[PDB]
C-alpha cells in the first residue's frame, strides 16, 4: 500500500483505553483507498515527533469506514497530526 494523499476527519471523541493508550477513530475524505494513514504525534513545542503509534500500519480501506488508531501520548500536552499538508487535521490532546 501507499501513504494517503487526502484529508481526514475525526468521527468520535477520543477515548482513553487505560492500558496507557488513547484511540482515535478517523474517516478518510479524499481518494486513493485502500491506503496508509499518515499519522504522527508531536511535542508541547509542536515541532519534534515524540511518542509512539501502537496500531501497526493503520489502513484506510475506503471513504466510508472508520480507521481505529491506538496510540501512546506523552503526559500533558501533545499534538496528533493526521494526513498531509495544511488540511492535515491537528488534534491538541491532553493526557492526565
Amino acid at each position, epitope marked *: 500500500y501507499t501513504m494517503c494523499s487526502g484529508k481526514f*476527519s*475525526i*468521527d*468520535k*471523541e*477520543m477515548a482513553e483505553t487505560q492500558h496507557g493508550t488513547t484511540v482515535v477513530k478517523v474517516k478518510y475524505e479524499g481518494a486513493g483507498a485502500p491506503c496508509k494513514v499518515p499519522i504522527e504525534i508531536r511535542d508541547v513545542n509542536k515541532e519534534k515527533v515524540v511518542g509512539r503509534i501502537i496500531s501497526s500500519t493503520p489502513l484506510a480501506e475506503n471513504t*466510508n469506514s*472508520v480507521t*481505529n488508531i491506538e496510540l501512546e501520548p506523552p503526559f500533558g500536552d501533545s499534538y496528533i497530526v493526521i494526513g498531509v499538508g495544511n488540511s492535515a487535521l*491537528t488534534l491538541h490532546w491532553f493526557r492526565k
Partner: single-chain antibody
Amino acid sequence: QVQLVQSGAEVKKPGASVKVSCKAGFNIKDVYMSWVRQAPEQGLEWMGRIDPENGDTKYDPKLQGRVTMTADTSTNTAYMELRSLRSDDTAVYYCARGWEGFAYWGQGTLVTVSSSDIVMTQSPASLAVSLGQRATISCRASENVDKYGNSFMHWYQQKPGQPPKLLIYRASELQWGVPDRFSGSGSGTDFTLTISSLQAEDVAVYYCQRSNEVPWTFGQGTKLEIKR
C-alpha cells in the same frame, strides 16, 4: 450513494409514543449517530446523539425525558422513541451520522400528531442577493466552539422537501463535491459562510452548527433568495 434508511412515515394520536428506525450501511459501533427534528417551515433542531459502542446517550434539554435513543450494533440500526406526543411534535425526523458535521443523513420520517447550554445566533434570518454577487451569512456562538485545537463549526444547505447537505465542516473545511465558490471562515465565537458568486442552485436555507460539546445546537437558519 446513501448509507441511512429510515422507517416509514407514521401518523399518531396525541399522547401516544412513536418509534423511528434507522438502518445504516456501515458499522455504527465506531460512529456518533444523531437525530434531528424539523417542524413544518421551522428550522433544524438537534435532538440527541448515541454512541452505539457504549450506548451513551446525550439528549437536548428540550426533549429530555421524552426521548429514548437506542442502537443495535449487530443489525447496524439506530432507533429513536418519542413519548407523550403533542400536535407540536408534528415534524420530519431525520437520522444522521457524524461528529465534524453530519455528512450522512436519512431520507426523513414524517411523524404527524393529530386528533452546557449555548445560544447560536445566525444573521440575518433571510437575505436576497443578485446572481453572481457575493453573499455572506454569519453565526455567533455564545460560548467557545473549539476542541482539540479546531473550531467545531459546520454549515448546511437545505433545499425544500430534502434532507440537509453538509457543506462546510470544522469551520473552514469543504466537504467533498461542494463547489469552490463556497467558503467558511472564523474562530472562537464569530464564523461566516460566504458564496463568492451566487448561482441559482444556491437558493436555499442555510444552517450553522456547533458540535464540540453537547448539545450540538443548530442555528435558526438563513433563507437565501435571489433579488429580482
